[PDB]
Amino acid sequence: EDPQLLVRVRGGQLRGIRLKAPGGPVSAFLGIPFAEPPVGSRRFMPPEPKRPWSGVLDATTFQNVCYQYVDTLYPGFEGTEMWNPNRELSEDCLYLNVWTPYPRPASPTPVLIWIYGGGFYSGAASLDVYDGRFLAQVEGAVLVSMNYRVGTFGFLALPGSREAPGNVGLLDQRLALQWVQENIAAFGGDPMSVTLFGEXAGAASVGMHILSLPSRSLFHRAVLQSGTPNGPWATVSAGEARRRATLLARLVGCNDTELIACLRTRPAQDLVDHEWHVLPQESIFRFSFVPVVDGDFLSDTPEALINTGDFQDLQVLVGVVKDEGSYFLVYGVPGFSKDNESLISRAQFLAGVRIGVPQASDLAAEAVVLHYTDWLHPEDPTHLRDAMSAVVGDHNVVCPVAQLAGRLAAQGARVYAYIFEHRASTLTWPLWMGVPHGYEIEFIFGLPLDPSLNYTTEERIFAQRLMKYWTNFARTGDPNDPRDSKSPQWPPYTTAAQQYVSLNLKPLEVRRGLRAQTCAFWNRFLPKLLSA
Amino acid sequence: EGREDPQLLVRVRGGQLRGIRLKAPGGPVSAFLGIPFAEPPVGSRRFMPPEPKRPWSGVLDATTFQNVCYQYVDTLYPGFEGTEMWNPNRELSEDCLYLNVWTPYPRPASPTPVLIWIYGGGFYSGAASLDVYDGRFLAQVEGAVLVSMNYRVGTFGFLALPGSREAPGNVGLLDQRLALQWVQENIAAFGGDPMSVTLFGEXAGAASVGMHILSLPSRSLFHRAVLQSGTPNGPWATVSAGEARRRATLLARLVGCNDTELIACLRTRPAQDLVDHEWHVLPQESIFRFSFVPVVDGDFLSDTPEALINTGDFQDLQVLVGVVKDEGSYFLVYGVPGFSKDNESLISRAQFLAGVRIGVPQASDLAAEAVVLHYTDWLHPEDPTHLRDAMSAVVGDHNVVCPVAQLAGRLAAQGARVYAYIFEHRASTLTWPLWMGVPHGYEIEFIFGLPLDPSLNYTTEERIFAQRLMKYWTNFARTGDPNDPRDSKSPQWPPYTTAAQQYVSLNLKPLEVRRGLRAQTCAFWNRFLPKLLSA
Numbered sequence A: 001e002d003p004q005l006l007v008r009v010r011g012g013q014l015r016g017i018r019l020k021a022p023g024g025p026v027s028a029f030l031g032i033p034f035a036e037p038p039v040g041s042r043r044f045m046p047p048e049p050k051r052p053w054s055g056v057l058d059a060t061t062f063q064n065v066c067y068q069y070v071d072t073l074y075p076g077f078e079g080t081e082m083w084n085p086n087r088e089l090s091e092d093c094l095y096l097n098v099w100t101p102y103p104r105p106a107s108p109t110p111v112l113i114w115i116y117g118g119g120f121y122s123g124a125a126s127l128d129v130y131d132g133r134f135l136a137q138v139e140g141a142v143l144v145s146m147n148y149r150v151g152t153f154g155f156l157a158l159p160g161s162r163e164a165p166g167n168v169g170l171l172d173q174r175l176a177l178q179w180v181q182e183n184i185a186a187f188g189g190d191p192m193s194v195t196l197f198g199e200x201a202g203a204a205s206v207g208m209h210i211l212s213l214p215s216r217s218l219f220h221r222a223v224l225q226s227g228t229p230n231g232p233w234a235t236v237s238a239g240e241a242r243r244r245a246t247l248l249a250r251l252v253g254c255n256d257t258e259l260i261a262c263l264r265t266r267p268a269q270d271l272v273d274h275e276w277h278v279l280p281q282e283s284i285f286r287f288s289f290v291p292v293v294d295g296d297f298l299s300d301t302p303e304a305l306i307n308t309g310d311f312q313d314l315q316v317l318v319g320v321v322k323d324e325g326s327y328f329l330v331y332g333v334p335g336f337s338k339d340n341e342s343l344i345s346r347a348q349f350l351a352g353v354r355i356g357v358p359q360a361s362d363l364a365a366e367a368v369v370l371h372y373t374d375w376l377h378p379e380d381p382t383h384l385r386d387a388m389s390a391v392v393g394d395h396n397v398v399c400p401v402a403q404l405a406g407r408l409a410a411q412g413a414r415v416y417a418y419i420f421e422h423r424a425s426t427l428t429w430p431l432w433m434g435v436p437h438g439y440e441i442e443f444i445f446g447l448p449l450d451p452s453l454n455y456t457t458e459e460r461i462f463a464q465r466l467m468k469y470w471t472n473f474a475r476t477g478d479p480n481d482p483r484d485s486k487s488p489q490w491p492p493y494t495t496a497a498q499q500y501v502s503l504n505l506k507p508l509e510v511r512r513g514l515r516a517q518t519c520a521f522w523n524r525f526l527p528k529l530l531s532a
Numbered sequence B: 001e002g003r004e005d006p007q008l009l010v011r012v013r014g015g016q017l018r019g020i021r022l023k024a025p026g027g028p029v030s031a032f033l034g035i036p037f038a039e040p041p042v043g044s045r046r047f048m049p050p051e052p053k054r055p056w057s058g059v060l061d062a063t064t065f066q067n068v069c070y071q072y073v074d075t076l077y078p079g080f081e082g083t084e085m086w087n088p089n090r091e092l093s094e095d096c097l098y099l100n101v102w103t104p105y106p107r108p109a110s111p112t113p114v115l116i117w118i119y120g121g122g123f124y125s126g127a128a129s130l131d132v133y134d135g136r137f138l139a140q141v142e143g144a145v146l147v148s149m150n151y152r153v154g155t156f157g158f159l160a161l162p163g164s165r166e167a168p169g170n171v172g173l174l175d176q177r178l179a180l181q182w183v184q185e186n187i188a189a190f191g192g193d194p195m196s197v198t199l200f201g202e203x204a205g206a207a208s209v210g211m212h213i214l215s216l217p218s219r220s221l222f223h224r225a226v227l228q229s230g231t232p233n234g235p236w237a238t239v240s241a242g243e244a245r246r247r248a249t250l251l252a253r254l255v256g257c258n259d260t261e262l263i264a265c266l267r268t269r270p271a272q273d274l275v276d277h278e279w280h281v282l283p284q285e286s287i288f289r290f291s292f293v294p295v296v297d298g299d300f301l302s303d304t305p306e307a308l309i310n311t312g313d314f315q316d317l318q319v320l321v322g323v324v325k326d327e328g329s330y331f332l333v334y335g336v337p338g339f340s341k342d343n344e345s346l347i348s349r350a351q352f353l354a355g356v357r358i359g360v361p362q363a364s365d366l367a368a369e370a371v372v373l374h375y376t377d378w379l380h381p382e383d384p385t386h387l388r389d390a391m392s393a394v395v396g397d398h399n400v401v402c403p404v405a406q407l408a409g410r411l412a413a414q415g416a417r418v419y420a421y422i423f424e425h426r427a428s429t430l431t432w433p434l435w436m437g438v439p440h441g442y443e444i445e446f447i448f449g450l451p452l453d454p455s456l457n458y459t460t461e462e463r464i465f466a467q468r469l470m471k472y473w474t475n476f477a478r479t480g481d482p483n484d485p486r487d488s489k490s491p492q493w494p495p496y497t498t499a500a501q502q503y504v505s506l507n508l509k510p511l512e513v514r515r516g517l518r519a520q521t522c523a524f525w526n527r528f529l530p531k532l533l534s535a
Helices: A133-138 A151-155 A168-187 A201-210 A238-252 A256-264 A268-273 A302-308 A346-356 A362-372 A381-410 A441-445 A457-476 A516-530 B136-142 B154-158 B171-190 B204-214 B241-255 B259-268 B271-281 B305-311 B349-359 B365-375 B384-412 B460-479 B519-531
Strands: A006-009 A012-015 A017-021 A024-033 A056-058 A095-101 A109-115 A142-146 A189-199 A221-225 A315-321 A414-420 A499-503 A509-512 B009-012 B015-018 B020-024 B027-036 B059-061 B098-104 B112-118 B145-149 B192-202 B224-228 B318-324 B417-423 B502-506 B512-515
Touching (some): A024 A133, A095 A168, A109 A168, A109 A201, A109 A457, A133 A142, A133 A457, A142 A168, A142 A189, A151 A268, A168 A201, A189 A457, A221 A457, A238 A256, A362 A381, A362 A516, A362 B519, A381 A414, A381 A516, B009 B171, B020 B136, B027 B136, B027 B171, B098 B136, B098 B171, B112 B460, B136 B460, B145 B171, B145 B192, B154 B171, B171 B204, B192 B460, B204 B305, B224 B460, B305 B384, B318 B384, B318 B460, B349 B365, B349 B384, B384 B417
Parallel strands (some): A012 A056, A109 A142, A109 A189, A189 A221, A315 A414, A414 A499, B112 B192, B192 B224, B224 B318, B318 B417
Antiparallel strands (some): A095 A142, A499 A509, B027 B098, B098 B145, B502 B512
16 A cells, blocks of 8 residues: 555545556546546536545546547548547546656646547547656646546536526536645645646637636636637537427427426437537538537626626636548548549539538638638649638638737737648658647647557657646746746737747747638628628 | 020921930030920810821921920929929920930931830829930930820810710820821931830839730830839729710719710810819729829720730740839838828837728729738738838839739740839938838939939939939840840840749849749739639
8 A cells, every 4th residue: 555646635535556657657536526427417417526436446546537429430540540549438437547756746836628529429538649648747737637527527508597507617627626726735736736728629619718707716827729719610609509409309309498308318328329410511620519609607708708808817728720621521421531632623623611600601611712812823632631620720710819829918918829840751642631629639648658559659749848838937927947047038929010920840940820811701891701 | 596506406207306405415506306206286186196297387496395285283292303303394285295305416327216205103193304304314325215295184085975077086095106206207306216116104104014015006116125113904994885985974063064065065174173183083092093094995995904915926026024122112101190291100010901992993892901911021910110011012013013013924935025123222412201212213313314313312323223224224125135245244134034934123233133022922813803803
């Protein structure tokens, strides 16, 4: 009975496991319950705190993944399976994990809380690419990750109702943050230095915590990687969420109370079977059950809340990858597949645009097509293919990121921005997808430090730089190595200068204006066009 | 006769002409100036198509430029050469339908290719007698036969009651065609080859040339066409029949006047009255819009230029087209607040947004916001130098550069051999401020070879450059090809094609070949902006 591996939290005692990191041991506490399992009458409802337990709870193993759709576009392909659930599915999944240094830190240590992506429909805190052993060993970070409910279970809302109020997946996360405040000290974490970070839907969740008052007391700093609370995919209106809920109930055989009561009597897979049948249009980068503008968790739309918020004492790190859009094309855009080069025709591109920008009128779609056509080479397949990617990535990620960056900075926040440009040598997707959405995660988490993974020596050094940027940011609100001249320095993003850095194998390079012309098209012109 | 220079007596269909022996740098040339080609379009003939000049008796003196067609005289900058060079340099009179001929001296052995110049002036001004249209250099150096005509401008040329007998519209274009007809019948008298007639013109002149391409009875009068900074398609060169009816009636009201009674009343008004009100008829506050212009009449123009270029067969057409670097700058001092020749014209964002309303006067609120969106540099949205330059770009692109690209594109896709250029050399003698770059109309003096006159203070490099451009224009006139068939060493000018979009820079340096005529930005004006109107 190793005493480093034994901790008393508010609900009782836990026993972790000593895990091996390349440069030494770390203590891991996996599968710690933070909530009553949200099952039976507790489906669709806010989480309640986990009841105290007797003896020593075994926290040496990952708990179940929250019940979710499993992807089957390319069966047994590492590029898709890496995002698939790697534990048993269950509605009983409200568990979090903690990695700390071994031995447990002497003074209070900055805490990093990870929130996975997966479009609010999938994900789990147990995937290899979120392995917190490296950050804990190399940087001495106390790293926390939680599971939160996704799909119907997390986000089916009949707004205004008592028994399916929406945003419960977000409340799951809020609960895990509360859990960190009350217990992290026992692990040697500093409840007074908590940095959130997440990617895609995880990023949007961080954004939503920024925009929800009761969450603000629970962290001091945020990182938003390739995602935002604002924009086309991360929220729906009360109206649209009611509509989708109602439609899913009809689809399965089911006054709000009676509707929910019926839905609650349904095997989990029955709900998932019909998850994808409630979208208004054939579309990519669009997800059926996502956070809802409820006037509660979210008091107004994210756009409203970011336009009018006050962000004086807030530090934010935001960024994107080089090819935010490529990934999604294979999942519904004719002419795109991982198996050839996906050189498309002009006709395929106009059709691709109606699917990538599903909310677009014929005129708006036209505006898009005309903007993204390279008129010197109007019918070149390579251009059209890359254009299709660009449309999707810009519309869904890069422009909402630019917009968030701008508002946050204008409204008193300290903002650092990046573009991640290094393609992993080990990447199993074809060359044309470039640096796809999600493939910086492995680097921030420090996986190249595992020599058994065959990342290049340069990549191992690159990963170390990034862990340093992120943990420096958690420590100080500033990603710059504070005991190190010569970098050059990562400048704050501002509305005037619009400076951001490239993250790749070469040293930091400062650039200005993050797709400024094209994002001006998306952020300033398309709104006017649609609303008229 | 008896004592006169034998080389200066020429007979044409209407009688006998005495010309003048002029000095050019390399030697003498013959000039026949003020040859009448129409009956004076005076009194009851105002607004009416031109009638061919009736034969005269005796030897008509053809030794001086004739009257300039009645027109608005610019007084924006009184005393200033930059504006005066464009102003009339002979008496204003409705009796103005005369043309001019320059030929080598002595007149050439074999039939020489003919170049016919049509001046610009927004269809409200111009004159073939201006110093920058002097044909002596092309005649002396290139051996060209050069012909330029006066045609009626403003109300006298373009005021129209579409459908009426007494003011059918487009009569200024008919003046031009009459002079093309005179060239066919008579040019051989001067050594010119009526089977090798090339039209060339700038701004409204360019637009005029294009309209002769698009109008069948003019098609048999020429073989090749040069269009400088102007197109028959675009937002300024034509009006709908309805719009012309509107402007004509309003002008009538303003001066004190079916259509017979109205036009008869207009005919009793003095010319200067009509000029005094011609600017009061425009639908919005604007620049690069002109009151009385060619009308889409279903006759001269059987349909809109845009329709005719989209669907015409231009198989045997050789066309040279181009623009200057700064098409829009000139126009800004004529009514965009914040702009002037006397300072740097650094402007605010507010002045930019207002400028766009004046520059794109036909644009709705949404279209105007699209323009502003597109031309704003989002790194430096408040920067005065960029805003000043973008104001210029907006006007240049909308009125000239994108109309030209549209034209070049459609013509090429449909049989034409098209050569395309961008002229980028600012004259060392230019009197306009530096911010205006290479303004509209400032290539003319080079094509015409004024730098060859030692007394004009152009640089040596400018003389050489002038000669180059003269070679290009007159080679194109001769062969449909601007290139030199001998000198294959020095760089080649490729045709412009839809696949490759090739054009050349014209400056002091040798030819450089570029791709895409503002391809991204012109997609906005030519493809998107129209669609933001079917809505």
